[PDB]
């Protein structure tokens, strides 16, 4: 019922300075000029009509036969000449549309019009604005790019190679005749995880993306947890071949629990179905399933096997240079200070992750905006260290 959405927005995010300057001003003027020239162009073209040809052949033949009164109903089934449509209050009509019949856009299970009286379908509501049962493609192909993350060059190269085996050089293993949908098993500390997301946006620069986080321990009798993702991955194959990011459910939803029977039926259903979809001998498609977790120990032996789920990748803690890069990225938007206090905040620091870096950068601006408002606050040289402590790292009685 959903194929694509009109992407006529996000007008050139590449504002090079991102800060108030003359170069950014000129780019905005060119942007704003180009908007009016288009509004010019379409307005000039729509009213300076090429020709006045009767009632555009619309009101003469079809608009009258469509009629004034109409009712909206779903279209059920298609036959060679007529159409089997299930209108409101459970009414079903076998009538051949021949006015405003866009056979491509009618489709089964879509809203169509009924001209009342002699009830004949005369049109279709292509928008219909209601495909709301299971929505996971709403966040498809996120705009985040490689540049948003830095200092993770080894992992970026590894994930890119694993995901550019398809798309790029598909004939490589096509001649090798494997077509492997191995996916990637991602490790990492619990202080990270949306980096497992941010490193995934590198592949999300191509095609779409789907996310299944938390889900459930599929208590549902039908199960279908990993199985509707299989349908959604099939829908992804219908679209540009998307990836399925199942972080934190490859660990909990697929747990290497020692228990065999009486284990909430997830071990019976979820793990088996995950292997069935991760096996290339059952389902085709360029869909790559990115399995990201913070507990490598709970890897199920079916998930452990590289024979079906290959391309194991470990995410380590950022190094000194990586900490410098991530702080530079996060503080680039904020213009921390003119003294550039960069290394003093990370030289001694250890076990600091991406989420912590974002938090301390956000709290640094908040504390300056509290009462130290000085544009580029001269206190930020040490207040950045003041809010990098911020306690809140770990706290548990004494026990020591």
Ligand X SMILES: Nc1ncnc2c1ncn2[C@@H]1O[C@H](COP(=O)(O)OP(=O)(O)O)[C@@H](O)[C@H]1O
The residues that touch ligand X, with contacts defined as CB under 6 A, are 148-152, 191-195, 197-198, 318, 326, 329, 353-355, 358
Residue 369 found at the interface with another protein (CB under 8 A): yes
Residue 180 found at the interface with another protein (CB under 8 A): yes
- Residue 65 φ/ψ, nearest 5 degrees: -75, -25
Nearer to another protein, 281 or 348 (CB): 281
Residue 308 found at the interface with another protein (CB under 8 A): yes
Residue 243 exposed, middle or buried by CB count within 10 Å (0-12, 13-18, 19+): buried
Tell whether residue 189 is among the known ligand binding residues: yes
- Residue 74 φ/ψ, nearest 5 degrees: -75, 150
Q: How far is the CB of 334 from another protein (least distance, A)?
A: 3
Residue 9 contact among ligand X, another protein, none, beta carbon within 5 to 8 Å by kind: another protein
Q: Which two tokens stand for residue 203?
A: 């592949």
Residue 46 found at the interface with another protein (CB under 8 A): yes
Asked if residue 192 lies in contact with residue 315, where contact means CB atoms within 8 angstroms, the answer is yes
CA 13, 16, 18, 24 torsion: positive or negative? negative
Tell whether residue 195 is among the known ligand binding residues: yes
Tell whether residue 270 is among the known ligand binding residues: no
Please give the torsion angle defined by the CA atoms of residues 349, 350, 354 and 356, in that order, rounded to the nearest 10 degrees.
Answer: -60
Q: How far is the CB of 237 from ligand X (least distance, A)?
A: 28
Residue 119 found at the interface with another protein (CB under 8 A): yes
Nearer to ligand X, 180 or 191 (CB): 191
Tell whether residue 225 is among the known ligand binding residues: no
Residue 54 found at the interface with another protein (CB under 8 A): no
Q: Which two tokens stand for residue 107?
A: 């489709």
Residue 35 found at the interface with another protein (CB under 8 A): yes
Restricted to residues 205-234, the positions that interact with another protein (CB under 8 A) are 206, 220-224, 227, 231
Tell whether residue 263 is among the known ligand binding residues: no
Tell whether residue 253 is among the known ligand binding residues: no
Q: How far is the CB of 163 from ligand X (least distance, A)?
A: 18
Nearer to ligand X, 61 or 333 (CB): 333
Tell whether residue 322 is among the known ligand binding residues: no
Q: How far is the CB of 357 from ligand X (least distance, A)?
A: 7
Residue 211 exposed, middle or buried by CB count within 10 Å (0-12, 13-18, 19+): middle
Residue 44 found at the interface with another protein (CB under 8 A): yes
Residue 341 exposed, middle or buried by CB count within 10 Å (0-12, 13-18, 19+): middle
Q: How far is the CB of 390 from another protein (least distance, A)?
A: 11
Residue pointed to by tokens 């459910």: 249
Residue 85 exposed, middle or buried by CB count within 10 Å (0-12, 13-18, 19+): buried
Asked if residue 266 lies in contact with residue 217, where contact means CB atoms within 8 angstroms, the answer is yes
Restricted to residues 252-281, the positions that interact with another protein (CB under 8 A) are 268-269, 272-273, 279-281
Tell whether residue 191 is among the known ligand binding residues: yes
Residue 145 found at the interface with another protein (CB under 8 A): yes
CA 202, 203, 208, 210 torsion: positive or negative? negative
Task: List binding-site positions for ATP.
Answer: 188-195
Task: List binding-site positions.
Answer: 188-195
């Amino acid at each position: 019922k959903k194929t694509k959405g009109p992407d006529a927005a996000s007008k050139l995010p590449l504002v090079t300075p991102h800060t108030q300057c003359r170069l950014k001003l000129l780019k905005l003027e060119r942007i704003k000029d180009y908007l009016l020239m288009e509004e010019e162009f379409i307005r000039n073209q729509e009213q300076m009509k090429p020709l006045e040809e009767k009632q555009e052949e619309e009101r003469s033949k079809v608009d009258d036969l469509r009629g004034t009164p109409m009712s909206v109903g779903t279209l059920e089934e298609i036959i060679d000449d007529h159409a089997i449509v299930s209108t409101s209050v459970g009414s079903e009509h076998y009538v051949s549309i021949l006015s405003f019949v866009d056979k491509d856009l009618l489709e089964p299970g879509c809203s169509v019009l009924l001209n009342h009286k002699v009830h004949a379908v005369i049109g279709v509501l292509m928008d219909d604005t209601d495909p709301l049962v299971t929505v996971m493609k709403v966040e498809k192909a996120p705009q985040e790019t490689y540049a948003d993350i830095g200092g993770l060059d080894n992992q970026i190269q590894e994930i890119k190679e694993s995901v550019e085996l398809p798309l790029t050089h598909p004939e490589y293993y096509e001649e090798m005749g494997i077509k492997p949908p191995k996916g990637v098993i991602l490790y990492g500390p619990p202080g990270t995880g949306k980096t497992l997301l941010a490193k995934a946006v590198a592949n999300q620069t191509s095609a779409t993306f789907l996310r299944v986080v938390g889900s459930e321990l599929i208590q549902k009798y039908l199960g279908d947890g990993p199985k509707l993702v299989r349908e959604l991955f099939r829908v992804a194959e219908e679209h540009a071949p998307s990836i399925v990011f199942i972080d934190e459910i490859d660990a909990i939803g697929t747990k290497r629990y020692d228990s065999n029977s009486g284990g909430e039926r997830e071990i019976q259903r979820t793990m088996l179905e995950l292997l069935n979809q991760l096996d290339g001998f059952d389902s085709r498609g360029d869909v790559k399933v990115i399995m990201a977790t913070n507990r490598i120990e709970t890897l199920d032996p079916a998930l452990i096997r590289p024979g079906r789920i290959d391309r194991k990748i470990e995410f380590p803690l950022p190094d000194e240079k990586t900490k410098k890069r991530i702080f530079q990225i996060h503080t680039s938007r904020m213009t921390l200070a003119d003294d550039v206090t960069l290394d003093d905040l990370i030289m001694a620091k250890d076990d600091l992750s991406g989420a912590d870096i974002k938090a301390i950068c956000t709290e640094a601006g908040l504390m300056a905006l509290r009462e130290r408002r000085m544009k580029v606050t001269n206190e930020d040289f040490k207040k950045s260290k003041e809010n990098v402590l911020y306690k809140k790292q770990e706290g548990t009685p004494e026990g020591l």
